[PDB]
Amino acid sequence: MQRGKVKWFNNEKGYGFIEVEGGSDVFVHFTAIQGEGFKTLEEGQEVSFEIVQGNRGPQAANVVKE
Amino acid sequence: MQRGKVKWFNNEKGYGFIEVEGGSDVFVHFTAIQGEGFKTLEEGQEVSFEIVQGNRGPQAANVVKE
Numbered sequence: 001m002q003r004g005k006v007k008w009f010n011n012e013k014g015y016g017f018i019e020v021e022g023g024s025d026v027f028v029h030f031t032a033i034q035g036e037g038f039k040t041l042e043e044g045q046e047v048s049f050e051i052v053q054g055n056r057g058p059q060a061a062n063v064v065k066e
Numbered sequence: 067m068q069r070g071k072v073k074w075f076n077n078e079k080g081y082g083f084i085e086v087e088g089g090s091d092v093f094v095h096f097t098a099i100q101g102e103g104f105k106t107l108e109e110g111q112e113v114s115f116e117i118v119q120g121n122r123g124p125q126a127a128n129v130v131k132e
């Protein structure tokens with residue numbers, strides 16, 4: 001698990017990228033976002049998350065908004 | 067039917083969140099807003115609305131400023 005801050009999120013498309021210290025930006029899809037409510041993120045939002053590797057490459061999992 | 071006050075609304079992006087007494091904040095997209103005028107909301111505006119569940123989580127529908 002790592003903390004990061006959303007760099008960009010296209011709310012209409014439902015995906016974006018998370019900046020992290022000491023790694024490349026991480027793709028995040030809305031289906032990774034946990035908890036109550038409509039699955040969305042704003043740029044600048046701080047989250048905790050894990051990275052998983054699929055056929056498309058690394059992406060965020062278990063994204064929890066701070 | 068619910069009543070709330072807009073907590074924040076990004077006019078450029080066309081979405082925000084409504085605060086409701088005794089529940090979690092509810093996402094609102096501009097396409098939910100009813101009426102003739104440009105589809106926008108100011109923070110503090112009183113609104114009536116319904117909550118619609120869906121794949122990406124709950125959001126407001128039939129939002130009326132009144």
Ligand code: NA
Pocket residue numbers: 019020021022023024025
């Ligand atoms: Na980085």
